[PDB]
Amino acid sequence: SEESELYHAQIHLYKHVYNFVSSMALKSAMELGIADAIHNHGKPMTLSELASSLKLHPSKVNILHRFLRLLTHNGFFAKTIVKGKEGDEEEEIAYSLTPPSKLLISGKPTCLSSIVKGALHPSSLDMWSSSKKWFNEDKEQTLFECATGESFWDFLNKDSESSTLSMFQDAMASDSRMFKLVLQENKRVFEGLESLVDVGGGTGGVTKLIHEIFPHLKCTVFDQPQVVGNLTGNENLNFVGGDMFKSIPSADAVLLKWVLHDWNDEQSLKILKNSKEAISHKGKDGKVIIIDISIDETSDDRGLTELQLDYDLVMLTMFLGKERTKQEWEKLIYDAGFSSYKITPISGFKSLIEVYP
Amino acid sequence: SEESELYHAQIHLYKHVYNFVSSMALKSAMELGIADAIHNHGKPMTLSELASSLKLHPSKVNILHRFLRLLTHNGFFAKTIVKGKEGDEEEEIAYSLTPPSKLLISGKPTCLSSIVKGALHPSSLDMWSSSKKWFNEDKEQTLFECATGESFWDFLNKDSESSTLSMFQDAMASDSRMFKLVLQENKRVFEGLESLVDVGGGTGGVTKLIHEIFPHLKCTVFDQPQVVGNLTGNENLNFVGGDMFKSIPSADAVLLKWVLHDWNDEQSLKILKNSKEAISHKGKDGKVIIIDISIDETSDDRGLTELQLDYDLVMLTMFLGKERTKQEWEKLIYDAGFSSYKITPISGFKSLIEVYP
Numbered sequence A, B: 001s002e003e004s005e006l007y008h009a010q011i012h013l014y015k016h017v018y019n020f021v022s023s024m025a026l027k028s029a030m031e032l033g034i035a036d037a038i039h040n041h042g043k044p045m046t047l048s049e050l051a052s053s054l055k056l057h058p059s060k061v062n063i064l065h066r067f068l069r070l071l072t073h074n075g076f077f078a079k080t081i082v083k084g085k086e087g088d089e090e091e092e093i094a095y096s097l098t099p100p101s102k103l104l105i106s107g108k109p110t111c112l113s114s115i116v117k118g119a120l121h122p123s124s125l126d127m128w129s130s131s132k133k134w135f136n137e138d139k140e141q142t143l144f145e146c147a148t149g150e151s152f153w154d155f156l157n158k159d160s161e162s163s164t165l166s167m168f169q170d171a172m173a174s175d176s177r178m179f180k181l182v183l184q185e186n187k188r189v190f191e192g193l194e195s196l197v198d199v200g201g202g203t204g205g206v207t208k209l210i211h212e213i214f215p216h217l218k219c220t221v222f223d224q225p226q227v228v229g230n231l232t233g234n235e236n237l238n239f240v241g242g243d244m245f246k247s248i249p250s251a252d253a254v255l256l257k258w259v260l261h262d263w264n265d266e267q268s269l270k271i272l273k274n275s276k277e278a279i280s281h282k283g284k285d286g287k288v289i290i291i292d293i294s295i296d297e298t299s300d301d302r303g304l305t306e307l308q309l310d311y312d313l314v315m316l317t318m319f320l321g322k323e324r325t326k327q328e329w330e331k332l333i334y335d336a337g338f339s340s341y342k343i344t345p346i347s348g349f350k351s352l353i354e355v356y357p
């Protein structure tokens, strides 16, 4: 017996084998618009009612039921027992939305539909059939290039991929929108700030959001001369062109939103150093705000670390990109000269790091 | 704040969105033969050593590392810290197998490679791109037929699918082999039995296994006249042709291995009734043994119920088949007249039901 003790070993194995089914079940739920239907019904909905709302063929009803059962077990729906109308139904089960599923209700600031649709789009999953060829080849490329022949970006730009591109940029907009919510949920981060520099803020889209929640904050959008060049306006809105590797505008705080996952530790350290100098005049009152993923391998929420590692693997297979771990984030901020830092989990699995001198 | 409280809602949502990545990571691990390599090294293996064993290009090494990190987090590998050979390596991490991964070592009775390879084969995953079309169409068919145009079985039989068919029948054999292990791990089930009837035992493949662990048990392979017709041999081996819906041979016990998930409750009840009569002469000493899936929705091992529900969904999308829940198994055995029953979990997520009169 000792050693050759299966079962515990098999349950674990199969559990990971069939994980994909849970994702496909969620995918279906959103592509069918179950949340919108129940929400529009605004009252626990019955299998028949939902079936009728989705205008499903009678043969597809029991398929809806099967998907509902699993999804309910996965916490995307709550089961209720409802009345019935006399000579029919007797005792029937009704379904209600749950916080997780409410995120799938469209026409709402919190809708994450487009994002889940892109994350589970065929162009995101089919490439995996080339994983073995990808591991054993001599060419350095993304798994997407290996399986498709072209890079992900070139694929979207094709003419026969017009719709695919609309979907992904809908997800992109949906992601930048959610930032607004991050601001709303973490006002204490920007509370005692008189000014802020949005490094690599491009045309000022993100600053605009910041201004929607904090109208009085003096924001200076910093980017390259060409990207900013002209642009002006507002007493609290600022556009200055320059090079973040040489110097970044002084302010109460420095925002680095999605600007460090593109640079290596060397280039990232210089940016952090220039960031510390830009707040240097505010002394121990200034702070650097980093918005990027941080994987906490030693976290107690194993599921969250796994989700983070999952995402990181998608960045690898699709773009050959990487996210940093909490420790390498620590090394970076300390090697830059800061005294402490505070990580705040945001948007499911992302992070908001507050760095203090 | 109340109601509009995200985060907890998002972490849950994304966790299910990106579940597929864990499956693809396991898929890679087996297609690369990481377990075989470490096992053949028979000592915790270093990233370099494994990289060299897999003969990976230098550019693919860091990809191996990324996949290893996640898989380790998912418990398929244990990290160790090893020596190093002087002027190189310094302190390097080594990887060891875990019970779950040891299941991937080939040339062993417990190897579940072929099974995981089929379960994660493109012919098993690509069809999901047609899920929306499948839900909204009027034709009753499997998701595989909807996306491919042909049934799963016809696909395997094609000439251009010779290899695909070898893979799936390797998985089938691998599954029937594992039964031998189920027997070894549950001898007390067949311990006090003098005889046994293997209903729908076909040509006696499964009885052969039963005879390997229990040489003295009198087994009578029961099936249709044509499938058995001739076949004879052995004092403890028996072949009798007939119809299980009319009557099944008497014996100390009746085995129903994968024979009930093909019949509806009506046909399944008749088979159970005829099974009770076949052991009727042994009184309260006889038993009916059912080997088929049982989903325990109220189980405390939520993960196992989810895995079972996952599998059940694959049977739906690929064959339009179904597995039963523990309660509907209960209704069946009680409506047949039995007094009690005992469910024993086997092979990861399957079940072995012992039914008593």
Ligand SMILES: Nc1ncnc2c1ncn2[C@@H]1O[C@H](CSCC[C@H](N)C(=O)O)[C@@H](O)[C@H]1O
Pocket (backbone or CB within 6 Å): A199, A200, A201, A202, A206, A222, A223, A224, A227, A242, A243, A244, A245, A256, A257, A258, A259
């Ligand atoms: N030397 C440099 N100085 C300042 N900005 C630079 C730079 N090199 C590149 N960039 C800018 O880096 C930005 C990276 S993208 C930054 C993302 C942005 N804050 C968001 O929320 O989406 C680009 O807008 C690019 O123009």
Ligand SMILES: Nc1ncnc2c1ncn2[C@@H]1O[C@H](CSCC[C@H](N)C(=O)O)[C@@H](O)[C@H]1O
Pocket (backbone or CB within 6 Å): B199, B200, B201, B202, B206, B222, B223, B224, B227, B242, B243, B244, B245, B256, B257, B258, B259
């Ligand atoms: N009326 C009947 N009586 C007995 N066997 C029947 C039958 N109708 C169909 N079968 C048999 O039902 C079996 C279902 S498959 C049973 C699976 C088998 N015990 C295993 O371990 O793989 C077939 O072998 C088929 O020949």
